[PDB]
């Protein structure tokens, strides 16, 4: 009654390059499996069994692994396998902070359809809790090496829990039972068979199985460094090694005296080869005694299984964006040092600037005081933003893992996450202008906060998402922070705040328009002189740090009448030389309106979310 | 013949809070064992066999943990706890770019000796490789997420060699058989029964053990949510039931029964507290049926066991320093890209720097230029040495598991720790100053571009050590890229570059001294205004950029004999007006000589890395 699905895997061969030597991992191992039987690996420790199902969940790298794996007699897309399959992985990769039903919670809402309501989701949730016996666990953290939450053995099972919440058609463990005790162990393969006998492919590793354990295993594969020694039923054991020479007694466990044997024919002289050449032998003595794949799989979501075309995810994007945001939102709650931190150094930083600035004046040095806090208060913002880099490289190992089988699509996740970093960059751009715009004195009343804000907020956003755009670059937080922080210093460099635009060379030019500095920093300077006519050097301030020494007030006015004399034009004690405008003109902000300079900054920022987006569709996958 | 030990635990009662109510880890717990011995902990997945063997261990908090813990009658003190035992946890912790041998040979190299030689350190790694059963492999690297290594059988063993190396009088194992195939967790019990029968106790968990492997068992503790419901030999478990009321039939597995009888007690009305209270009983009937510690330790080493006063490291301080360098070391040639992109940031930013700076000149713009040509290369030298924050961050977990047991002083660690970093400092440091100093121009000929190497690198040594003191201070890489970008700021705004040190406020003068920028910037001035005498302003650059216009050569002669009637000096078109000691007095680089700033930043660079050890004496353990 469920739909049928034979898992055809042939001449798998995986060989790796040993740094320039090659070692073959896998050779020519093949074998099949059905829908309602669970196919158990075994072996040694160290003899292939995370290699051969990380060679059929599509795992590791095309053109490295030989051999073809089929469903129902056609070639079992990696399009495909995406769509109809789970993997839980030898060790575990959790989100630490939360507990254990916000954990399968989130496993729920992604992989669950919305035709399945919340609440149905919810009892979901609270059923696999019971069944995998970790109800005492439910409300305490996952937990790391440095945070003690939950044992081993219980995030084990919410390991297990996270892709068994959805019922898969192929269902990749490896050894799910590790770290189990003996009746936990027993309650886990119960939930595996009732899963198979709905209508899925299990393939599972395990290591010491009971008499129990193997009573609900149909197929059994031994492994022996990288060959295949036994394929078939556990009561077909005792009769295979009866003919290979060396019986098993009735009173010993089955599977130790195999290994046992296997072990001790890797140290003889002739090896394994002899038992490898037995089992073809063995397997080819045993054969002697309509629906399309597209159509039987879509048979198969019709009869209940992944909960008519098959959709690639459970769900449309905008609900994949409301899931992930709540588990940013989740991870923030539960460590709020992270952004009370952020909050922290930016309103320190306000604050400082506050009392070394306090209320600048119309003066020579008033002007230079101006320029110096804008290029101070616009390079602190981009260097805060570069503590985004380990947002998305602590995190990246599960979002490989999530997306390897469909649980959001790539794009949901830069969605999402320029989302839930947006309220943060409000909440320091807020902490910043308001200790800064009227305690340093600037101009424009409340349109010119209202544009102080903006730009800051700009700024934080163009900041974080060419941070961001470097973290998917990088594979590594200290490469990351060596190149951020250099190319930080370039965009400061030829911002026009350090030397002039007339004064960077001509083959630097193209790269003192890409700075990211550049733009907000020209946009503040016309919003503070935005008074064409506001005088800042009045003519007797002329003199004020000429390399002439100090000079007294009346002597400024002789040198007032005598440089009248020579110049023609008639300098007063209160004729103004130099402007607001004339200020714009000598740092060289001429060329965009500060609306235009805060429409390029927004634009940066989300050209490098594209751009990081791109760089999850070419990379970010962990491949063999 | 083996010095006896018995280690007697009793009434350990543990309560964690749940983040407010309280939640009782473990209850009441009592047992001993004795040298020569195996105590198996078992019990279901969360019962508290981890937390036991915690509590046991010295690895959770002291007030937090109840009941006595002693050795031979007398308590076990922390202090001898870290000399004579060691732990293998549950989670495998190791660097993942060594290989399997090279791990074993750092930690032989830890734990043995000096009267051991070298080639018998070797012996001792091969042996334990070969009876541990991972020749195979011994080449491979370990591996994490997103390197492929060995597998995860493998690694268990490695962390059961990193602790059996030597050979310890106390040895705790969490789980050590998990994730082990049948026939090498036999192998494993095999090797920790010869260390026990050596004079050893061993305490262990563990979850399915075999037939063959209980018997290697002599005692066993089951535990059902933090309560001992049996403690004897594996012969007395059919005897126990029979007793409680539930016998064991002969063909079905021991500890599979007790593990089923158990958690069928647990969702019971009554819970498992009837068999709590039965197993007090039996411990009751079977009590009816000279050499001080600190001399049978000694008496102990004499005999072999960890290989006469009781030394608590194996080595001398610089024997850890020389074995921790070449860890460091081991770990930078197997990510050259780490050092080398470290290397080609700094070359690159003292390329663009010699093409926008390329041969400053003697004129009031050339000032200008040198003085932020200056204030750029110090402030992306503090900059750079961020990077340097998530180096202890990423050691931190393994640095903590290894001195927890007194594999090396944590004073060994910061010694090491400042050696490795050094000659890439001054690789960096020659990288910079051959790249800036006679393209921009810089003065002195020889003897100048040598204090330039010099300041250079003390820069760089300053602020890798202030990084470094504040990677022990927080937990966290964000955390501390967030303080770390903060403070460097507040540094550069105090430093005497953005604002004079005339116009720092008064509240504000202490943290200007205490900049670490300062000390190397002002040292920079006084080796390029190393010419007091040097004429930078010529008397017709009075009025370079007035605000006036640009002015004809000839009228600005006009000016100069203008400005010569109102002020008595005569300046004509050749007079100098600002010398090399001019500018230092305009800047403010007056207090000190640059060899005593010079002798600050080096300074500032001993005093961080002594906060850094103080931060490693107060904080840095992981307990509970
Ligand atoms: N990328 C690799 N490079 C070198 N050796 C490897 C690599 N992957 C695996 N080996 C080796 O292949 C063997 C089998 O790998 P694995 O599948 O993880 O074993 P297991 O049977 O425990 O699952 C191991 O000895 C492992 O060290
Ligand atoms: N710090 C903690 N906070 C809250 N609950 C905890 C904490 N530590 C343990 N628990 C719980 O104590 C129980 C036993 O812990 P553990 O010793 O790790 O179990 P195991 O028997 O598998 O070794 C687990 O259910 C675990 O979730
Ligand atoms: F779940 Be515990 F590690 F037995
Ligand atoms: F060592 Be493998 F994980 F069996
Ligand atoms: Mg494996
Ligand atoms: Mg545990």
Same mark, same amino acid.
């Given at each position: 009654?469920?739909?049928?699905?034979?898992?055809?895997?042939?001449?798998?061969?995986?060989?790796?390059?040993?740094?320039?030597?090659?070692?073959?991992?896998?050779?020519?191992?093949?074998?099949?499996?059905?829908?309602?039987?669970?196919?158990?690996?075994?072996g040694?420790?160290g003899?292939?069994?995370?290699?051969?199902?990380?060679?059929?969940?599509?795992?590791?790298?095309?053109?490295?692994?030989?051999?073809?794996v089929?469903?129902?007699?056609?070639?079992?897309?990696?399009?495909?396998?995406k769509?109809?399959?789970?993997?839980?992985?030898?060790?575990?990769?959790?989100?630490?902070?939360?507990?254990?039903?916000?954990?399968?919670?989130?496993?729920?809402e992604?992989?669950?359809?919305?035709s399945?309501?919340?609440?149905?989701?919810?009892?979901?949730?609270?059923?696999?809790?019971?069944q995998?016996?970790?109800?005492?666990?439910?409300?305490?953290?996952?937990?790391?090496?440095?945070?003690?939450?939950?044992?081993?053995?219980?995030?084990?099972?919410?390991?297990?829990?996270?892709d068994?919440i959805?019922?898969?058609?192929?269902?990749?463990?490896d050894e799910?039972?590790?770290g189990?005790?003996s009746?936990s162990?027993?309650?886990?393969?119960?939930?595996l068979?009732r899963?198979?006998?709905?209508?899925?492919?299990?393939?599972?590793?395990?290591?010491?199985?009971?008499?129990?354990?193997?009573? *609900?295993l149909? $197929?059994? =594969?031994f492994? /022996? &460094?990288?060959?295949?020694v036994?394929? @078939?039923?556990p009561?077909?054991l005792?009769?295979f090694?009866?003919?290979?020479?060396?019986?098993?007694?009735?009173?010993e466990?089955?599977?130790?005296?195999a290994l046992?044997?296997?072990?001790?024919?890797?140290?003889?002289?002739?090896?394994?080869?002899?038992?490898?050449?037995?089992?073809?032998?063995?397997?080819?003595?045993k054969?002697?005694?309509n629906?399309?794949?597209?159509?039987?799989?879509?048979?198969?979501?019709?009869?209940?299984?992944?909960?008519?075309?098959?959709?690639?995810?459970?769900?449309?994007?905008?609900?994949?964006?409301?899931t *992930?945001?709540? $588990?940013? =939102?989740?991870? /923030? &709650?539960?460590?709020?040092?992270?952004? @009370?931190?952020?909050?922290?150094?930016?309103?320190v930083?306000?604050?400082?600037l506050?009392?070394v600035?306090?209320?600048?004046?119309?003066?020579?040095?008033?002007?230079?005081?101006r320029?110096?806090?804008?290029?101070?208060?616009?390079?602190?913002?981009?260097?805060?933003?570069?503590?985004?880099?380990?947002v998305?490289?602590?995190?990246?190992?599960?979002?490989?893992?999530?997306?390897?089988?469909?649980?959001?699509?790539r794009?949901?996740?830069?969605?999402?996450?320029?989302?839930?970093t947006?309220?943060?960059?409000?909440?320091?751009?807020?902490?910043?202008?308001?200790?800064?715009?009227?305690a340093?004195?600037?101009?424009?009343?409340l349109? @010119?906060?209202?544009?102080?804000?903006?730009?800051?907020?700009?700024?934080?956003?163009?900041?974080?998402?060419?941070?961001?755009?470097?973290?998917?670059?990088?594979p590594?937080?200290?490469?990351?922070?060596?190149?951020?922080?250099?190319?930080?210093?370039?965009?400061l460099?030829?911002?026009?705040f350090?030397?002039?635009?007339?004064?960077?060379?001509?083959?630097?030019?193209?790269?003192?328009?890409?700075?990211?500095?550049?733009?907000?920093?020209?946009?503040?300077?016309?919003?503070?002189?935005?008074?064409?006519?506001?005088?800042?050097?009045?003519?007797?301030?002329?003199?004020d740090?000429?390399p002439?020494?100090?000079?007294?007030?009346g002597?400024?006015?002789?040198?007032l009448?005598?440089?009248?004399?020579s110049?023609?034009?008639?300098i007063?004690?209160?004729?103004?030389?130099?402007?607001?405008?004339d200020?714009l003109?000598?740092?060289?902000?001429?060329?965009?309106?500060?609306?235009?300079?805060?429409?390029?900054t927004?634009?940066?920022?989300?050209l490098?979310?594209?751009?990081?987006?791109?760089?999850?569709?070419?990379?970010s996958?962990?491949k063999?």
């Amino acid at each position: 009654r469920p739909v049928p699905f034979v898992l055809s895997f042939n001449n798998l061969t995986y060989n790796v390059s040993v740094r320039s030597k090659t070692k073959t991992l896998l050779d020519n191992i093949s074998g099949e499996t059905r829908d309602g039987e669970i196919l158990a690996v075994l072996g040694a420790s160290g003899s292939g069994k995370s290699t051969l199902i990380d060679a059929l969940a599509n795992r590791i790298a095309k053109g490295s692994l030989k051999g073809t794996v089929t469903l129902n007699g056609e070639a079992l897309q990696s399009r495909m396998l995406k769509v109809i399959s789970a993997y839980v992985m030898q060790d575990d990769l959790l989100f630490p902070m939360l507990t254990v039903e916000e954990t399968l919670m989130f496993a729920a809402e992604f992989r669950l359809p919305r035709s399945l309501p919340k609440s149905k989701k919810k009892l979901r949730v609270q059923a696999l809790i019971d069944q995998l016996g970790i109800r005492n666990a439910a409300k305490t953290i996952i937990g790391d090496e440095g945070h003690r939450g939950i044992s081993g053995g219980e995030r084990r099972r919410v390991s297990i829990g996270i892709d068994i919440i959805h019922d898969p058609i192929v269902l990749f463990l490896d050894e799910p039972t590790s770290g189990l005790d003996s009746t936990s162990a027993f309650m886990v393969v119960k939930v595996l068979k009732r899963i198979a006998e709905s209508g899925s492919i299990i393939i599972m590793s395990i290591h010491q199985p009971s008499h129990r354990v193997l009573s *609900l295993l149909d $197929r059994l =594969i031994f492994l /022996s &460094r990288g060959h295949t020694v036994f394929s @078939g039923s556990p009561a077909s054991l005792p009769s295979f090694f009866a003919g290979f020479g060396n019986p098993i007694p009735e009173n010993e466990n089955q599977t130790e005296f195999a290994l046992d044997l296997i072990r001790e024919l890797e140290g003889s002289a002739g090896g394994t080869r002899g038992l490898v050449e037995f089992n073809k032998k063995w397997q080819e003595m045993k054969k002697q005694s309509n629906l399309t794949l597209k159509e039987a799989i879509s048979a198969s979501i019709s009869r209940g299984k992944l909960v008519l075309a098959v959709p690639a995810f459970a769900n449309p994007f905008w609900i994949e964006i409301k899931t *992930l945001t709540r $588990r940013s =939102i989740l991870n /923030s &709650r539960r460590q709020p040092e992270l952004l @009370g931190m952020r909050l922290a150094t930016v309103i320190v930083t306000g604050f400082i600037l506050a009392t070394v600035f306090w209320r600048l004046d119309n003066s020579p040095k008033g002007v230079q005081e101006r320029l110096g806090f804008f290029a101070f208060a616009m390079s602190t913002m981009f260097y805060t933003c570069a503590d985004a880099l380990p947002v998305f490289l602590q995190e990246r190992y599960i979002f490989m893992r999530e997306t390897a089988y469909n649980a959001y699509r790539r794009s949901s996740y830069v969605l999402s996450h320029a989302i839930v970093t947006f309220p943060s960059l409000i909440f320091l751009s807020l902490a910043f202008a308001v200790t800064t715009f009227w305690a340093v004195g600037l101009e424009g009343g409340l349109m @010119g906060f209202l544009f102080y804000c903006l730009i800051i907020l700009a700024s934080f956003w163009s900041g974080s998402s060419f941070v961001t755009f470097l973290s998917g670059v990088v594979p590594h937080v200290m490469l990351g922070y060596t190149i951020v922080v250099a190319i930080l210093a370039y965009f400061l460099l030829f911002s026009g705040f350090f030397i002039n635009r007339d004064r960077i060379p001509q083959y630097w030019i193209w790269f003192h328009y890409l700075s990211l500095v550049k733009y907000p920093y020209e946009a503040v300077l016309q919003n503070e002189f935005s008074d064409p006519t506001e005088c800042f050097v009045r003519g007797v301030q002329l003199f004020d740090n000429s390399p002439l020494g100090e000079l007294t007030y009346g002597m400024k006015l002789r040198l007032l009448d005598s440089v009248s004399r020579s110049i023609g034009m008639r300098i007063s004690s209160s004729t103004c030389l130099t402007t607001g405008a004339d200020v714009l003109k000598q740092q060289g902000v001429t060329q965009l309106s500060k609306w235009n300079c805060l429409l390029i900054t927004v634009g940066f920022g989300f050209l490098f979310r594209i751009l990081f987006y791109l760089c999850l569709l070419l990379g970010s996958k962990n491949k063999r």
